[model samples]
Target: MKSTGIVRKVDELGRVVIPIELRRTLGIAEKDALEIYVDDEKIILKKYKPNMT
Candidate 1:
């Protein structure tokens, strides 16, 4: 995992916009599926991959 050294505030609905640079590097597209995980005090988001690919 790498950091862009950027920070963003969560909105009233608790949403944060991922930076465009990261999206392009990660191949994230509009309406792409995301996987969420919570452990203790942290939340993680990852692009979802289908097994059939």
Candidate 2:
């Protein structure tokens, strides 16, 4: 696995901010929903896009 070399601290409510650079590269904007998944020992975050043709 490759790391993006970015680290963030989780808030009291269990939230971490995604870096602006990553968000723009991934086309994620405010109010975008991210789907979280567990794969063995890893937690994955994926941008959720619905209503596609």
Candidate 3:
């Protein structure tokens, strides 16, 4: 559990614009997809493994 202290907002339609200042520096965006979790209506960010070699 660590962070870079960077923050961005998701649009009304739940659109995201990646900040390379973020974890992904490969491009203007990231291929990492987020999975929504259901628990007390709380949200959790889910990142999958990109095992591209």
Candidate 4:
């Protein structure tokens, strides 16, 4: 799925809200686990899923 760039400013506590549409489409319920990855100068956050294959 293609997503328009969403720019968010992280608060002092490092909190940012994901767009409601994204959460709904991704099935990201409240308190769901998320995986964070940092590489070089980029940071990525995604829902965590255990390997099943």
Candidate 5:
């Protein structure tokens, strides 16, 4: 995995704001849902794209 060389600190509300550049690169936008998972000690965040029935 490659890093963006960007660092973010969690806010008092336990929220971390993703960088605008990274968000644009990943096509993430406001109101988009993200899936969160934990493996070992790492936290993973994936854009939620569900298949239509």
Candidate 6:
């Protein structure tokens, strides 16, 4: 869809929350696994689909 800057800051332990609306649209369901990619200034949250391929 579009873009969102909803997060103001990463809370303690560098954790961030994703809204249900965002997750719903992204097709992130129960126990959705993610590939953490924390680069220099960006994070690439890749979904884990080991069950698929």
Q: Looking at candidate 1, what is the lDDT of residue 20?
A: 76
Candidate 6 structure quality by residue, lDDT tens digits, 7-51: 545789976666667567667866786667888898876666567
lDDT string, candidate 2, 1-53, tens digits = 22386567789887777777767766887977777888998667887766679
The true-structure Cα RMSD of candidate 1 reads: 3.1
Against the unseen true structure, what C-alpha lDDT does each candidate score? 0.72, 0.74, 0.53, 0.73, 0.73, 0.67
Q: After aligning candidate 5 to the native by TM-score, how far in Å is the CA of 16 from where it should be? A: 0.6
Could you report the Cα RMSD, in angstroms, for every candidate shown?
3.1, 3.3, 5.2, 3.6, 3.4, 3.3
**Per-residue error at 17 for model 5, in Å?**
1.3
Who wins the lDDT comparison? 2
As for TM-score, the candidate ahead, 1 or 2, is 2
> Tens digits of per-residue lDDT for model 1 on 1-53?
24555677788887777777766766787877668788888777777765664
As a TM-score, model 1 comes out at 0.66
Candidate 4 lDDT, tens digit per residue, 1-53?
33577686687887777777877766776887668888888778787775658
lDDT (Cα, 0-100) at 34 in candidate 6: 66
lDDT of 3: 0.53
Better of 3 and 6 by lDDT: 6
List runs of model 4 lying over 4 Å from the truth.
1-3, 50-53
Q: How many residue-pair clashes does candidate 2 contain?
A: 0
Q: List the residue pairs that clash in candidate 2.
A: none
TM-score of every prediction relative to native: 0.66, 0.68, 0.37, 0.64, 0.65, 0.53
Q: Native-vs-model 6 lDDT?
A: 0.67
- Model 3, 1-53: lDDT tens digits are 22455466788887755455443543224545655576786555555445689
What TM-score does candidate 6 get on C-alpha atoms?
0.53
| Best candidate according to TM-score | 2
